[PDB]
């Protein structure tokens, strides 16, 4: 949907 990210573990 809107913005940019990650990853997590």
């Amino acid at each position: 949907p809107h913005g940019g990210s990650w990853g997590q573990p």
Partner: antibody
Amino acid sequence: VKLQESGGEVVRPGTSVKVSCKASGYAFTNYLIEWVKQRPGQGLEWIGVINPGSGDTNYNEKFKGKATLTADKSSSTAYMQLNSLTSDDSAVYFCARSGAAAPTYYAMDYWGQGVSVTVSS
Amino acid sequence: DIVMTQSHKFMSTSVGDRVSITCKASQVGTALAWYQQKPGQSPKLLIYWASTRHTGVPDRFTGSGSGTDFTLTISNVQSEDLSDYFCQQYSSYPTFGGGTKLEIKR
């Protein structure tokens, strides 16, 4: 751990098609499911994304008329339905997992085998 | 509508050689991914967030860059590495590169 898509279709123009991604080996509701289109020799085109848990959806503007995305959490399955099919619609369509499910865009970590769709008379 | 271009568009290499694949963007990010597609196969993610290897990807694959220029570098190329590579940006809604195909010299 996989995504399994439904078999290839041949369909007629002006009809509708629905393709399935079935998810196994992970938590279906925690990860976004994205859909992508690949015509031969052409660039990948993003169609849109769904949050399986909600499941809220985000669409490429181009595809807003064409594509409807839905999720059925009980079966771990995601669906794409495509309407008013025309020739430009013929392609292979991939479903892919991307980020932890939240409304942000991600890189796409795992891909289904992909579903060839042919639109012809 | 961010646009992704890979300009040099076939590349040649020898097994055991090193090759670099360039990727350009029409606007900034750190959100870039690299992918590998064998013909008749689905893409496999290699690198995300510009420099981070996806699980299972071998070490001879590295990615670098930020902003508008990005590179995917493969060293000690194996026969199995001959194939299609493209980038994707997730800074805004995803758009992908045209791709670069890798070829062996002979």
